[PDB]
Scaffold this active site. Structure first.
Site, PDB file in Angstrom:
ATOM      1  N   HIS A 113     -32.039  47.867 -17.127  1.00 46.70           N
ATOM      2  CA  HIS A 113     -32.901  47.148 -18.055  1.00 46.70           C
ATOM      3  C   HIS A 113     -33.889  48.051 -18.794  1.00 46.70           C
ATOM      4  CE1 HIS A 113     -35.653  47.310 -14.563  1.00 46.70           C
ATOM      5  NE2 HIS A 113     -36.605  47.232 -15.477  1.00 46.70           N
ATOM      6  N   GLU A 138     -28.119  46.283 -11.414  1.00 52.92           N
ATOM      7  CA  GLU A 138     -29.266  46.936 -12.030  1.00 52.92           C
ATOM      8  C   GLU A 138     -29.158  48.453 -12.018  1.00 52.92           C
ATOM      9  OE1 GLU A 138     -29.814  43.843 -13.220  1.00 52.92           O
ATOM     10  OE2 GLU A 138     -31.788  44.731 -13.591  1.00 52.92           O
ATOM     11  N   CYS A 143     -39.776  51.651 -13.681  1.00 55.78           N
ATOM     12  CA  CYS A 143     -38.375  51.389 -13.382  1.00 55.78           C
ATOM     13  C   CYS A 143     -37.510  52.578 -13.780  1.00 55.78           C
ATOM     14  CB  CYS A 143     -37.907  50.122 -14.095  1.00 55.78           C
ATOM     15  SG  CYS A 143     -38.745  48.623 -13.525  1.00 55.78           S
TER      16      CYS A 143
END
Lengths: 179, 175
Positions: free
Chosen positions: A28, A52, A137
């Site tokens: 993402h 992910e 992230c």
């Protein structure tokens, strides 16, 4: 060279050079529509998106200064892994986290899968220097096996309290079917 | 940790020091330049040097760092407090290390007797690590924590135990 040199900006987040040809990150944070990564056209890059987790293999070596590194899928339950957070302000934060079972987490309108962990700073994870932030992230989770470093995945999400974190791994393991 | 707190950390002798106020400067007795005669352009005679264990306070006659304010200094921290060791490296990197603070005690480290408040690093690695911990030459870096809405300094780094995640914070007093 330093291990922090392997952590670079990528899209809206970060990414980690496992080897001169292998680069892992969170899905993402990748640019939604780009033309080239590190000067290499997209069509010439082997890109694998597993949940992910995202891995990129390049046809020719890119970061020729780093050496190969072990990429396991998660860590044994109870292992105190380390999340290596880089901030755009220049700080380097090694945050310890005890790893637990694999699980899915309800976040936003969707669900995110990976190995669950809990930071050792406890409820103090609401502080900026003691917990994670959505901008982290893609930062790697590592732990020391013997005298070697082993990366188990990248940061992808955290719970509402900020103490429980989710590490994105290469994929979940189902149980076997014999004969 | 705002940029002001980071700007208060300055190089000093064999390690680092911390500007608590425009005139007060805390550091570790281990990193003091022994063969020196002037600190920040001031002769040693005019500076009040007070040594409490490995902790060292320097009171200057004239204000030196007029850009900084005055912040709170505490004689140690309550047990269980999660503080931040703010390490600056010669490479220019900033490294905030989380450390859980415990009781005051005395150890023998590398043949030297060192007392202070003990803490354990929450970095996953041992306290002696180049990439993930502290190094010789990181002494003098402050331990900071946010009490209510005040950033306070509880002491300075003076020693790291070998083979574990233990660190020693030199404080101004046992309470």
């Amino acid at each position: 060279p330093s291990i922090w040199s392997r952590i670079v900006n990528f899209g809206s987040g970060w990414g980690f050079w496992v080897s001169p040809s292998l680069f892992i990150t969170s899905t993402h944070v990748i640019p939604q529509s780009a033309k080239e990564f590190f000067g290499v056209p997209i069509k010439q890059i082997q890109i694998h998106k597993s949940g992910e987790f995202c891995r990129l293999r390049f046809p020719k070596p890119i970061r020729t200064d780093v050496t190969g590194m072990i990429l396991e899928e998660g860590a044994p339950e109870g292992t105190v892994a380390t999340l290596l957070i880089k901030r755009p302000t220049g700080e380097l934060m090694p945050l310890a986290a005890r790893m637990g079972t694999h699980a899915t987490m309800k976040i936003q309108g969707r669900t995110v899968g990976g190995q669950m962990g809990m930071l050792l700073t406890g409820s103090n994870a609401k502080s900026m220097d003691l917990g994670t932030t959505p901008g982290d992230c893609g930062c790697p989770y590592i732990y020391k096996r013997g005298n070697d470093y082993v990366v188990i995945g990248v940061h992808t999400a955290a719970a509402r309290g900020g103490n429980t974190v989710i590490c994105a791994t290469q994929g979940s393991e189902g149980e076997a079917t014999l004969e």
